[PDB]
Design an enzyme around this catalytic site. Structure first.
Site, PDB file in Angstrom:
ATOM      1  CD  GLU A  92       0.350   8.110   0.215  1.00 34.32           C
ATOM      2  OE1 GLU A  92       0.056   8.105  -0.990  1.00 34.32           O
ATOM      3  OE2 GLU A  92       1.218   7.360   0.690  1.00 34.32           O
ATOM      4  CG  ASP A 149       3.397   9.276   2.064  1.00 31.49           C
ATOM      5  OD1 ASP A 149       2.665   8.338   2.493  1.00 31.49           O
ATOM      6  OD2 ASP A 149       3.500   9.562   0.860  1.00 31.49           O
ATOM      7  CD  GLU A 181       7.108   7.400   1.660  1.00 32.67           C
ATOM      8  OE1 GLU A 181       7.318   6.423   0.906  1.00 32.67           O
ATOM      9  OE2 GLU A 181       6.684   8.488   1.249  1.00 32.67           O
ATOM     10  CG  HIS A 240       1.690  12.209  -1.978  1.00 32.86           C
ATOM     11  ND1 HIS A 240       2.284  11.868  -3.173  1.00 32.86           N
ATOM     12  CD2 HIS A 240       2.528  11.771  -1.007  1.00 32.86           C
ATOM     13  CE1 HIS A 240       3.457  11.309  -2.938  1.00 32.86           C
ATOM     14  NE2 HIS A 240       3.633  11.239  -1.633  1.00 32.86           N
TER      15      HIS A 240
END
Ligand SMILES: *[C@@H]1O[C@H](CO)[C@@H](O)[C@H](O)[C@H]1NC(C)=O
Ligand SMILES: [Cl-]
Ligand SMILES: [Cl-]
Ligand code: NI
Ligand code: NI
Length: 430
Positions: A212, A214, A217, A228
């Site tokens: 992942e 990101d 956010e 991640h």
């Protein structure tokens, strides 16, 4: 899962731009699709609900395999039920939408076709988008991110998944989420436990892990950028506590990094960069262009607002690191100062880069946080620490903020608006 059609499935159109080396960009005719967890699931070809409230029907779903054979996913009324609308290159997700029931947010995937997710290979390339977070208060997270999902939602691997990408199957992320009702062509009924604080959700015996990235956010108060890694690049099914993540007895006992190497400018000592109004460099009451650039050495970031380019600010007061780049040096300095080994235990940037060298699916979502009230993003966290604890302060929201029932009642007309997605080689989108 099977497919039913008492509610039609029509994917909202969404335009985006593909740019090439030299800066020429062309319009791509994309669309978006709602994640399968938000859908109505009932007996195939018709009959009783397989899932209702936060519990399964034992007759229809005596085990995971039989449940998936007996149960179908339905189409979605994107605007009327889910508060999801598009116009040209703009996508809006409303927070609370009331129709038959109260719906909270959504998770959507960008599609190449009605049967395939779009797959973006990020390394050596950049991703740009515009966002309006002005209507996102404390406790909300409008997220734009990438996960190593299969383009067909797993349909070619798992023949009992007859729904595929058209119905938003196949989600995975670095939490190894166990709240999913369907994973790899099977239901998640065996060992299912309803959530004590949420009438619509629960936690099953399996989770769905994958890498992942990101990108975004955020709400109007705070924002974070977080790779991640996972030990396996793509989707793997995990069992129980060995999933790790928040809903497990050992957060770090799985194969993914649930924490990530995060960059939140506020957490890194710059308290005037991002926030509402003219006191901040980037004013969250107005639209923001966010550009993220990926290299084998690191992840770089700049913003454009009102035509003015602002690079990511340098980390301020972080022992042993003075730059503005998510690179191996930063991630190590962060762990040394703030604590933790999860990111490097799970292979760090080298392992992240393997996922960035393959296809990843673009996810757009809006959610509130039934585990930690989004305090990790926009407040002081954990709350038994204070500002003096290194990395504790992530934003200006109260430590009492973000309780889901409260924010849902107080700010139901909150929303996020994503627009003008552009993707191409580094330097090509601007
Ligand atoms: C925060 O970032 C802004 C914009 O880059 C910069 O002008 C300011 O000096 C930074 N603050 C600190 C404390 O480094
Ligand atoms: Cl300060
Ligand atoms: Cl402050
Ligand atoms: Ni099992
Ligand atoms: Ni301050």
């Amino acid at each position: 899962q099977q497919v039913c059609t008492t509610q039609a499935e029509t994917h909202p159109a969404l335009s985006w731009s593909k740019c090439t080396s030299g800066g020429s960009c062309t319009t791509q005719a994309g669309k978006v699709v709602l994640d399968a967890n938000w859908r109505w699931t009932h007996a195939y070809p018709s009959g009783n609900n397989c899932y209702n409230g936060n519990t399964w029907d034992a007759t229809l779903c005596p085990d995971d395999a039989t449940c998936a054979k007996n149960c179908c996913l339905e189409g979605a009324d994107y605007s009327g039920t889910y508060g999801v609308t598009t116009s040209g290159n703009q996508l809006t997700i409303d927070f609370v939408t009331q129709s038959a029931n109260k719906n909270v947010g959504a998770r959507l995937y960008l599609m190449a076709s009605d049967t395939a997710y779009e797959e973006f290979t990020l390394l050596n390339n950049e991703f740009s988008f515009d966002v309006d977070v002005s209507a996102l208060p404390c406790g909300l997270n409008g997220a734009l991110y990438f996960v190593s999902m299969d383009a067909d939602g797993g349909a070619s691997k798992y023949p009992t998944n007859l729904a595929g990408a058209k119905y938003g199957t196949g989600y995975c992320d670095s939490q190894c989420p166990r709240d999913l009702k369907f994973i790899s062509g099977q239901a998640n009924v065996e060992g299912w436990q309803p959530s004590s604080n949420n009438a619509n959700t629960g936690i099953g015996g399996h989770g769905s892990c994958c890498s992942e990235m990101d990108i975004w956010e955020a709400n109007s108060i705070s924002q974070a950028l977080t790779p991640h890694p996972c030990e396996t690049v793509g989707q793997v099914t995990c069992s129980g506590d060995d999933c790790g993540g928040t809903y497990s007895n050992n957060r770090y006992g799985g194969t993914c990094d649930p924490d990530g190497c995060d960059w939140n400018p506020y957490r890194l000592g710059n308290h005037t960069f991002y926030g509402p109004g003219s006191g901040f460099t980037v004013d969250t009451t107005k639209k923001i262009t966010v550009v993220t650039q990926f290299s084998s050495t690191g992840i770089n970031r700049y913003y454009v607002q009102n035509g003015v380019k602002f690079v990511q600010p340098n980390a301020s007061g972080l022992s042993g690191y003075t730059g503005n780049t998510i690179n191996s040096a930063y991630c190590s300095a962060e762990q040394t100062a703030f604590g933790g080994t999860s990111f490097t235990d799970k292979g760090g940037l080298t392992q992240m880069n393997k996922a960035l060298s393959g296809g990843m699916v673009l996810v757009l979502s809006l959610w509130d946080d039934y585990a930690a009230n989004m305090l990790w993003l926009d407040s002081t966290y954990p709350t038994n620490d204070t500002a003096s604890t290194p990395g504790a302060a992530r934003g200006t929201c109260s430590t009492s903020s973000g309780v889901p029932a409260t924010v849902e009642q107080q700010s139901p007309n909150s929303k996020v608006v994503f627009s003008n997605i552009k993707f191409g080689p580094i330097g090509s989108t601007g």
